Ligand binder design. Structure first.
Ligand SMILES: Nc1ccn([C@@H]2O[C@H](COP(=O)(O)OP(=O)(O)OP(=O)(O)O)[C@@H](O)[C@H]2O)c(=O)n1
Ligand SMILES: Nc1ccn([C@@H]2O[C@H](COP(=O)(O)OP(=O)(O)OP(=O)(O)O)[C@@H](O)[C@H]2O)c(=O)n1
Ligand SMILES: [Mg+2]
Ligand SMILES: [Mg+2]
Lengths: 221, 220
């Protein structure tokens, strides 16, 4: 048996959204954003269990929307994404799960096929993430000039990301803060598998991102 | 001082879609992809004229789907985006527009808001583009080994991109090849106004993009 557990990150504050309420708890088509990806995991046969990571003040709001035997616990997040990840790893330690899938709840439109593909792709290498080839010109702003960044081999890292539990754990053993989990895992000399995603995997990050999420949400269920 | 013309670029081959039909002419909800941005320009009061740049053998396909006076013409593109843009500039010499707005037809879901907002903001420096702040971890591949790009100040550059006519002309007049038109214009020492857009401005570039195009099309 090789238990696969999914970690749903929903402890962030969504400061860049400029709303009262963290983005993951905004309603679209009558459900909170975090519910969309949650039920992809609950309907997914590749997923043996789920951990939802949120801030202490959101535990009840979550508890009252989630009744499913696959949910192993609601777990207190940290002040950062990486700390929220670590908090989940400590909770999962008692279960000794073989593989772990991590996903930003703010990417709500997660497909079944992506979950299973990233997990089997993590079986072979130890580490994998959904990703997307760049399709735009890319730039950096330096003191009122824009640098045009070279584009060959550039990819947006999405989530889900999936790892053998021991690898991801080993990578967080000494703390650290990163945007994602492939970065710390790679520091161990582990190759990161890229798995073709699509633009539905975008992260609701800014106020403008809501128009699009409502549009997909209308079609979803 | 005024006329604004949108240059709608539709002369690409879309070779990364791995179709046999360029993505601009793919049928979504009974309409070809170029029809969508086209109608935004047509329905838009900020736009006095439209030039459509396409490949010679697709001319009649484009003509057939033109139902409006506002379309000034159909120009034959070139083998690169830059060359296709230059093709249109030449055609427009006779129209003497004040500002030109250039837009990738493979970015189908353009809004009114952006067409006018991009043009307003092009007036201050003579150059502006729709842009989108990065919101993903970003990486570069280097032979079965990836590298993490620093994210500070990183934007995805979109279209529409609008310029004063004269300036764009000056940026292209010695030829050249670039992914967009802000880069050559900046080389002339012009500051580029970034205009905040949204993810609906994505460009249908890969096969995996079509589903999302279909979802949004159902709502137009
Ligand atoms: N302490 C944190 C911070 C981040 N996240 C999660 O990490 C994911 C991706 O991060 P991001 O989009 O940046 O979320 P926020 O931190 O909430 O957004 P912002 O930077 O605008 O505050 C989100 O699902 C978010 O809830 C988390 O679980 N715990
Ligand atoms: N010779 C060319 C090539 C590009 N474009 C236009 O530039 C826009 C954006 O470029 P891109 O996505 O790269 O289009 P393609 O070149 O067709 O795609 P590919 O790189 O796969 O061939 C498209 O709307 C395309 O029609 C153009 O008009 N003339
Ligand atoms: Mg954040
Ligand atoms: Mg191209």
């Amino acid at each position: 048996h090789h238990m696969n557990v999914a970690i749903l990150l929903a402890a962030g504050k969504g400061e860049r959204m400029s709303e009262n309420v963290p983005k993951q708890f905004l309603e679209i088509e009558g459900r909170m954003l975090f519910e969309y990806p949650l039920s992809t995991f609950l309907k997914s046969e590749a997923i043996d269990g789920v951990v939802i990571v949120t801030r202490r003040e959101w535990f009840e709001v979550v508890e009252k929307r989630v009744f499913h035997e696959k949910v192993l616990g609601i777990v207190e997040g940290g002040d950062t994404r990486s700390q929220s990840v670590r908090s989940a790893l400590e909770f999962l330690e008692k279960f000794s799960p073989s593989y772990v899938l991590v996903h930003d709840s703010a990417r709500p439109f997660l497909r079944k096929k992506h979950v299973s593909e990233v997990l089997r792709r993590a079986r072979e290498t130890g580490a994998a993430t959904l990703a997307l080839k760049n399709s735009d010109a890319l730039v950096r702003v330096e003191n009122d000039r824009i640098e045009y960044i070279p584009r060959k081999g550039v990819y947006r890292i999405l989530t889900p990301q999936a790892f053998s539990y021991e690898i991801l754990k080993k990578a967080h053993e000494n703390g650290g803060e990163w945007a994602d989990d492939t970065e710390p895992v790679q520091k161990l000399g582990v190759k990161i598998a890229l798995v073709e995603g699509d633009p539905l995997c975008f992260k609701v990050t800014f106020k403008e991102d809501l128009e699009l999420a409502r549009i997909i949400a209308r079609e979803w269920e």
